[PDB]
Structures are given as structure tokens and as C-alpha cells.
Design a protein around this ligand. Sequence first.
Ligand SMILES: NC(=O)C1=CN([C@@H]2O[C@H](COP(=O)(O)OP(=O)(O)OC[C@H]3O[C@@H](n4cnc5c(N)ncnc54)[C@H](OP(=O)(O)O)[C@@H]3O)[C@@H](O)[C@H]2O)C=CC1
Ligand SMILES: COc1cc(Cc2cnc(N)nc2N)cc(OC)c1OC
Length: 165
Amino acid sequence: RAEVGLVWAQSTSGVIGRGGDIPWSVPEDLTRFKEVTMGHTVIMGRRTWESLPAKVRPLPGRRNVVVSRRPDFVAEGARVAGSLEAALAYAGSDPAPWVIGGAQIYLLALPHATRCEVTEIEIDLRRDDDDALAPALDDSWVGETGEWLASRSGLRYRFHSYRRD
Ligand SMILES: NC(=O)C1=CN([C@@H]2O[C@H](COP(=O)(O)OP(=O)(O)OC[C@H]3O[C@@H](n4cnc5c(N)ncnc54)[C@H](OP(=O)(O)O)[C@@H]3O)[C@@H](O)[C@H]2O)C=CC1
Ligand SMILES: COc1cc(Cc2cnc(N)nc2N)cc(OC)c1OC
């Protein structure tokens, strides 16, 4: 088995996206994200692809895979996959492909997943109807939660690192 991983950043309340963007500034999260995903396949939903600045995509040093129901969708510098099953196939021999968002794609991949790396951001965001939300993890997941750390931005964050099987 490839060890299928999910990686995301959420507010304590579970928001991951608002108005198409990440609704906070925590540089340290992007560092952790890169440190987690470098050298691996990164699988993402079409909307997440379009949320990435055009100048920042595809993510360098990683095989980019975009999931869309449209067989003719084009993602320059990425492979387009018609299902999470097809995306995982494209990861080939990668021992640890990572699913990197967003909300709909996390729900799709969750049944396949054996690792989650979650950054929690201490910011008071009240869930709105149009927010993208993190999936809820049940207690079949085990691992560790680090201490709260001060970001350069003045917010606190911490890492959660879970596995199952
Ligand atoms: N805080 C964080 O860690 C992160 C936050 N984000 C945020 O999350 C938000 C995006 O999340 P979300 O809106 O849910 O969108 P997603 O990024 O999950 O992509 C949704 C798209 O995936 C495709 N898709 C969904 N299900 C299937 C399926 N079963 N088979 C084939 N294709 C499928 C569809 O594309 P199509 O319509 O083209 O067919 C759909 O529109 C953005 O705001 C982004 O900024 C993103 C990544 C990380
Ligand atoms: C490298 O920059 C981005 C990375 C991500 C995805 C992402 C970001 N952080 C974490 N912890 N997990 C993720 N999947 C999402 C982004 O925007 C939606 C990014 O652009 C700022």
C-alpha cells in the first residue's frame, strides 16, 4: 500500500477556505506544507488548483494532479484525473502521495487515507454557509499534537500528526 496522506490548515472552528482563499496569514504553515509534500505527488480538486496563484503553480518539485469531472479540463504542468481512484493511479510508485485540498476532495480521499498532517490556526472564524470546511476525524486516528507556537503574523498555530492502520 502507498500511504495516502491528507494535509490541510484549519481554524480551530474547522474553516479551511473563504471567498476562494485561505482566510489568514501564517507563513509557518506554508513552510510545513512544503516540508511535508516535497518530492511527492500532490493531488488536488479543480477549485484548489485555481485558488493557487498562476505564478505559484504547478507546485515545484512535486508531481501535480488535478481532479475534475471534465475529461477535457486543462491544468498546465499538471496531470488531470477523472476520479481520486485515477489520481492515485497516476501517483505510480510514490510511497506517500498527499492530498492537498480542498473540502470536497478531502471527503473523497478520507476512506483511502492512513496519514493526516493538520496545522491548527488560533483565529476566531465563525463558520459561514459558503466556507470550505475541514473533514472531521474520528478516533480511529492516532498520533501527536504539538505545543502552540507564535507565528510572525501574531497568531498562534500548532501541528497535529495522525496515522491509522
Ligand atoms: N486551508 C487549507 O489547507 C486549504 C484551503 N483550500 C481552500 O479550499 C477551497 C476549495 O475547496 P472546495 O471548494 O471544496 O473544492 P475542491 O478544491 O475540493 O475541488 C472541487 C472540485 O473537484 C472536482 N470533483 C469533486 N468531486 C469529484 C469527483 N467525485 N470526481 C471527479 N471530480 C470531482 C470538481 O471539479 P469540476 O467542477 O471541475 O468537475 C469540483 O468542482 C478553496 O477556498 C481553497 O482556498 C484549499 C487547499 C488547502
Ligand atoms: C503553497 O501555497 C498554498 C498551499 C495550499 C494547500 C495547503 C496549505 N497549507 C497546508 N497545511 N495544507 C495545504 N494543503 C493552498 C494554498 O491556497 C489555497 C496555497 O497558496 C497560498
